[PDB]
Ligand binder design. Structure first.
Ligand SMILES: O=C(O)[C@H]1[C@H]2CC[C@H](CC2)[C@@H]1Nc1nc(-c2c[nH]c3ncc(F)cc23)ncc1F
Ligand SMILES: O=C(O)[C@H]1[C@H]2CC[C@H](CC2)[C@@H]1Nc1nc(-c2c[nH]c3ncc(F)cc23)ncc1F
Ligand code: NI
Length: 277
């Protein structure tokens, strides 16, 4: 049970990475899934029975019409909506380097939990606004990673304005990343202009919680607008999802739940033998 899961993830990640470089990735992935065995059992038979929710694995499940977790993955983090709703409106925005970006802006009030491996968070947000972020983590590194993802996800104008120079990030297949991911890789290379330009505010010490400044220094006095660090940020609903040619998994409203771009780069050595085509 434990070894099949470890091995299935490794096989799924390899398949999505190989498929993603092909002209029609969906068809490539479907080939490899149907002609791959893990410890002697067929991979499609493992997918039908195994309950693991992982980004590469869930892309493969979707590919063959299996139900998956309704969560979505942004910046490595799993997001579950705990409350509220939104609608979608495409808008042109202008970066700090005067580059147009067409963005599907979400309009509404929504509350989510973010769960990464080294940090978790509660996010509350409105139309192009971070309302509040309560974040936990292992360290300075891991906490800042979660803050950058929440800031980009919020769609705020100060985040858009803090962009410096052009955004032409590409995937392994030489195709441009879509705008939200363009923004995310930019601020993942450097979040300094982002944090400086975000804004600061006075806070009252709720015990358990602390402020954090644009240089990541804690404080009891001030914090970055909306953001508080904490010490412990507190089950699966399977649903039908869709898949396209480029392995983008979507909900019924067309929000991208998963993609090649949200599959972890970790190479790892399988515990049960994996035989490909
Ligand atoms: O995909 C498979 O491995 C099996 C299982 C899971 C999907 C189908 C239903 C059973 C598929 N069944 C069959 N596939 C195929 C088959 C040939 N090339 C393929 N490439 C991708 C694929 F996906 C299925 C196939 N041929 C006869 C079948 F009878
Ligand atoms: O809009 C999309 O197609 C994708 C890409 C950009 C961010 C998410 C992950 C990739 C997004 N997916 C999803 N977003 C959302 C979503 C709700 N409110 C939001 N506000 C801003 C935002 F940015 C995304 C959202 N819900 C479910 C999703 F599944
Ligand atoms: Ni994207």
């Amino acid at each position: 049970n434990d070894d099949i899961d470890q091995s299935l993830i490794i096989a799924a990640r390899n398949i999505v990475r190989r498929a993603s470089v092909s002209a029609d990735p969906l068809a490539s992935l479907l080939e490899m899934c149907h002609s791959t065995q893990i410890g002697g059992t067929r991979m499609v038979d493992i997918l039908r029975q195994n309950p693991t929710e992982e980004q590469a694995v869930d892309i493969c499940k979707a590919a063959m019409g299996l139900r998956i977790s309704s969560s979505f993955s942004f910046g490595g983090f799993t997001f579950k909506r705990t409350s509220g709703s939104s609608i979608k409106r495409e808008e042109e925005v202008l970066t700090g380097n005067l580059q147009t970006l067409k963005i599907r802006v979400h309009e509404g009030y929504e509350e989510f939990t973010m769960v990464g491996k080294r940090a978790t968070a509660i996010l509350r947000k409105a139309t192009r606004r971070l309302v509040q972020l309560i974040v936990s983590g292992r360290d300075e590194q891991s906490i800042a990673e979660a803050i950058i993802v929440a800031m980009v996800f919020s769609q705020e104008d100060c985040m858009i304005k803090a962009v410096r120079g052009d955004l032409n990030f590409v995937n392994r297949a030489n195709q441009r990343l879509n705008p939200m991911h363009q923004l995310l890789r930019h601020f993942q290379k450097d979040a300094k202009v982002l944090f400086q330009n975000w804004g600061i505010e006075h806070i009252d010490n709720v015990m358990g919680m602390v402020g954090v400044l644009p240089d990541m220094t804690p404080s009891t006095e001030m914090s970055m607008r909306g953001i508080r660090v904490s010490k412990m940020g507190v089950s699966t609903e399977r649903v039908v999802v869709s898949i396209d040619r480029f392995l983008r998994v979507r909900d019924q409203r067309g929000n991208v739940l998963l993609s090649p771009e949200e599959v972890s780069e970790t190479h790892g050595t399988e515990r049960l033998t994996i035989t490909y085509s």
